[PDB]
């Protein structure tokens, strides 16, 4: 298995996707059910940091992560307080470019 050969045929893998326009609809002070219905179910949510709904994406090809874009959102008292991640920027750029 060592010293792999240049067999140029490798399956592409993905991790999650999110709609760009719906990202702009996010507003601070949002409840859990409404944000889940509006943006989508998070594909990665640990049980060690309950409040940390995450969304990622990685077109992988033999370990080498080609492209990625992650979006996080933090909750407390059952209401949205703040978000972060490079997804907001690229989402805004794509919304300004397409529309």
């Amino acid at each position: 298995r060592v010293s792999l050969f240049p067999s140029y045929k490798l399956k592409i893998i993905q991790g999650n996707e999110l709609e760009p326009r719906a990202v702009a609809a996010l507003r601070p002070g949002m409840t859990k059910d409404q944000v889940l219905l509006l943006l989508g179910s998070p594909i990665l949510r640990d049980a060690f940091h309950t409040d940390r709904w995450d969304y990622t994406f990685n077109t992988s090809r033999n370990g080498i992560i080609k492209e990625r874009s992650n979006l996080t959102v933090y909750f407390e008292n059952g209401v949205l307080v703040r978000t972060e991640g490079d997804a907001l920027q690229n989402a805004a750029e794509a919304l300004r470019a397409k529309q």
Binding site: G15, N16, L44, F48, H49, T56, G63
Partner: protein
Amino acid sequence: AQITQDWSVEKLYAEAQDELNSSNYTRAVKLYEILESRFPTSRHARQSQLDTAYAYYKDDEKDKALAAIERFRRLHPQHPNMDYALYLRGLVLFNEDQSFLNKLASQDWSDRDPKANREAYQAFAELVQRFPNSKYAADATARMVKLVDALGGNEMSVARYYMKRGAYIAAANRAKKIIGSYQNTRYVEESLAILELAYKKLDKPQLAADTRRVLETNFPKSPFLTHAWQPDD
């Protein structure tokens, strides 16, 4: 039906059991129902209802075995030999796969399926709950713990296969499932390590630090602290 000869129920049962001993099943089942059709009011009828399911278990087919064992379950719900029914159902539904062509004495049991294993575990749980003290209960508990270990092994194998492909986003979820719903098994101090590796491979330092802290406070001496995880084989 070709002989249909009058006899005594005792010699019918003797002929039936000695044909069973001679690895005769196709002709046995056809000579099993004849005695209960001719003599329904007899304990030999119930003995036939049991050993026909036993013989069906001795062969590869299982649907007829399940049908017969359910027939007995619904027919005599209070016979003292009810313990044999549940145990036979558990062994049939476990898919023992009794064949010397594929003995493989190791048989880690992490390959058969989740379906039959789960149903056999449920059957043995019903058995141990019904008869907590019978002629055989410790064997039931041993097979039950072996089956839950096999389920844990299947989950761990599915988790491991994804880590060799790059889909860390899936190994993370599968390891989280194993951590949160598969205690009492042996795959605990490895699921944490593979989850840490998956979190680190996706540029999430806080998650990796937290899960590594949990690992080190739950296992002070483990090779996964110094050496990062590495898929074997």
